[PDB]
Amino acid sequence: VRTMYTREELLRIATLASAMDLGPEVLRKFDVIEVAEPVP
């Protein structure tokens, strides 16, 4: 007895999620994540 969602329900709600974005405050913190470098 708690707030539960199914995978398909979450994937449906993702369509709504598509209407929301992030400001620079929360979005700048994603810059710490680093892409792998190339291997020449």
Add this chain to the structure above:
Amino acid sequence: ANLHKLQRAWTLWYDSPSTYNTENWEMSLVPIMTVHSVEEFFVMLRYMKPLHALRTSSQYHFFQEGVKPMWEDPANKKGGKLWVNLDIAAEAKTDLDKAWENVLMATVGEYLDCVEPFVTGIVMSKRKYHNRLAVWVSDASATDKIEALKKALTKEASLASMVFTKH
């Protein structure tokens, strides 16, 4: 704003050699974003980097709010972690990314344990040869709960090792 609230808030963290704090190891962790709704969760996912493109020595942590991804945390002191070793213009998502997304969705959706909470967080760790997925729980003595987590984690994944470890 009709949002779809979660049972719990969840904070995302990222660490790597570039964040490695030689003086204080704990500060090597960088909290990125907290999510309280399904929409926030999917926005987070939007702006997260895929593991296929992530750096060789990096770790995503995803833990209940107010719970650090460390054993010293009171939430993880008694518990342990159940982990597995997976293997390695636009392209289709890799099976590794798909399994990561599935486990994250199971975490936020609370169907990682379908019955205090038992699951405290999860950790993806990009290594040289392997990729370690880990589900950090709170009670290492619960055998039935660990078996339920085993079947669940095996379901939500489809990408070589499975090991439980008390902290």
